[PDB]
Structures are given as structure tokens and as C-alpha cells.
């Protein structure tokens, strides 16, 4: 698909201590590359991917500076939304924010976005036109009008159409051999007996990137997605992914069922069968 640079902010108040905690994680597509934790000793923005490590201190000082300025603002922001909702000052609450840019085929902004949530619920969002906001309730409308009064959107827009897509291009270059080439799944099938009239076949897909795959079971060209056990795609721990699909067939009919794997790392889609 089209590539994307994204950042996730998490601000959690800790009315207990007098403070709050602040997280940033940076992603290019589904690959984490930077992180920030306000609770880390002498906290700064840190590399989280081998290919970003080559950045100079001038890069890290800037991101670190921006992280702490943002972390300080959110210290008050938590108190503000609390007051917006007339909530007690005892409970720990959370604000989340995601924003980023998609790269178009012309090397320009395809689409830009920002969305914010409070305590797990949609709060405010930047519109596709990048010149206006949509608020989900009253509290967010107070916030919406403030950002209209100082024209927050125009700073966001100049960022998204410029700096965001530019750095994205660079990151795609820096990490081209992990980001930009597809990694095909390592596939095999296993057999697991249940009872007299039940044998479970499990089709494995391991170490693939990107995250998007298709796993299906067919019975003589006939879909079995109805009684197929399929798991949520899971991280391998190295920037690649795992998934499996299973179904219970009769102890005689192993060869009558085929697993079909489709992933962009694959040249031709696969049909697998137990041996």
C-alpha cells in the first residue's frame, strides 16, 4: 500500500503523585522506529530501529526538545479535560493522539490526519481538508474553538504537506531493505488429533512483513471459512508477523483439504497440504 509516517501520543494522569506520564511511539507503516517516555531517567527520544540510529545528535536533540514541550503541555491538558467533564481529581485518566501523513505516487501528501481520544472515546479529529475540525461532544467543542482561534490547523497542514512527507521519504530510504521489500511467510502445516472423529490441521504463516495476509482453507475448492479457527496476526518480535489457520477434518480426509496463503512477498499464491 501507500506508505505512512505516524506518531502516537499517550498522556496518563497520575493523581496520586502530583504528575502524569507521557508516551510517544513513532511508526513508518507498521514498523516502530522511535520512542519517548517521560518517566525514563533523563528522558529523551530514542532510536528503536537499526536504520534510524544513523541520525546525528542534532536530530535527536530536536525530537527530544519537542517531546518535552509536548509532555509539559499535556500535564495541563489532562486537568483541562477533567474540568471540561466536571470529573473528580482522584482518578487516573488518559488522552491519546494519532497523526500522520500518507505518501502519494507523486511524492506529495496523499492524505493527512489527526485524531484525539479521551478515556478511550473519540474526542476531536482534523477533517480531510485539513482546514477544519470535527468535535464529538461539548468538551471537544471548547477545544475546537480554541484551535480555530489560533489556527492550529494551518500549522498542522503545513507540517503534513511538507515536513511530514519529506522525512517519510527519507525514512523509507534509510530502512529500504526492511521497510520497502516484502517479506514472504515461512509456511508449514501440522496435524493434531482430538477424538475419534476429529483431527485438527493447522496452517502456519511465520516471519512475514507486511502484516496483511490471506489464509484460507478449502475443501476440494470449497471454502471452509465457517468452521476455520483463525488467530489474530501477532508480532514475531523482530518486526515481522505470525498467523495460523486451523480446522477439524476427519482422520481420513487430510488430503481433501488445502491451505491457501496469499502475501505480497509471495510470487504466486500458495496452496499447501499436509504430508
Amino acid at each position: 500500500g501507500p506508505h505512512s509516517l505516524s506518531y502516537s501520543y499517550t498522556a496518563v494522569s497520575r493523581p496520586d503523585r502530583g504528575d502524569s506520564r507521557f508516551f510517544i511511539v513513532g511508526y513508518v507503516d507498521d514498523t516502530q522506529f522511535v520512542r519517548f517516555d517521560s518517566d525514563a531517567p533523563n528522558a529523551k527520544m530514542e532510536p528503536r530501529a537499526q536504520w534510524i540510529q544513523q541520525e546525528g545528535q542534532e536530530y535527536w536533540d530536536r525530537e527530544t526538545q519537542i517531546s518535552k514541550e509536548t509532555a509539559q503541555n499535556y500535564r495541563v491538558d489532562l486537568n483541562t479535560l477533567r474540568g471540561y467533564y466536571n470529573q473528580s481529581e482522584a482518578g487516573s485518566r488518559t488522552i491519546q493522539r494519532v497523526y500522520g501523513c500518507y505518501l502519494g505516487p507523486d511524492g506529495l501528501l496523499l492524505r493527512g490526519y489527526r485524531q484525539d481520544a479521551y478515556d478511550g472515546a473519540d474526542y476531536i479529529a482534523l477533517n480531510e481538508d485539513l482546514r477544519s475540525w470535527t468535535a464529538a461532544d461539548m468538551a471537544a467543542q471548547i477545544t475546537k474553538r480554541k484551535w480555530e482561534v489560533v489556527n492550529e490547523a494551518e500549522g498542522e497542514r503545513s507540517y503534513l504537506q511538507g515536513r511530514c512527507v519529506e522525512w517519510l521519504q527519507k525514512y523509507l530510504v534509510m530502512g529500504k531493505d526492511t521497510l520497502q521489500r516484502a517479506e514472504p511467510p515461512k509456511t508449514h502445516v501440522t496435524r493434531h488429533p482430538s477424538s475419534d472423529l476429529g483431527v485438527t490441521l493447522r496452517c502456519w504463516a511465520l516471519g512475514f512483513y507486511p502484516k496483511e495476509i490471506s489464509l484460507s482453507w478449502q475443501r476440494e475448492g470449497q471454502d471452509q471459512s465457517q468452521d476455520m479457527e483463525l488467530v489474530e496476526t501477532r508480532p514475531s518480535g523482530d518486526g515481522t508477523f505470525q498467523k495460523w489457520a486451523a480446522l477439524v477434518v476427519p482422520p481420513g480426509e487430510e488430503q481433501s483439504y488445502t491451505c491457501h496463503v496469499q502475501h505480497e512477498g509471495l510470487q504466486e499464491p500458495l496452496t499447501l497440504r499436509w504430508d
Binding site: E63, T70, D77, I95, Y159
Partner: peptide, 9 residues
Amino acid sequence: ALLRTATYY
């Protein structure tokens, strides 16, 4: 690279 805004809620 991060966006440099510090606009309160």
C-alpha cells in the same frame, strides 16, 4: 520528525 505545536486543549 515530530510536529512542533503546543496548543492546549
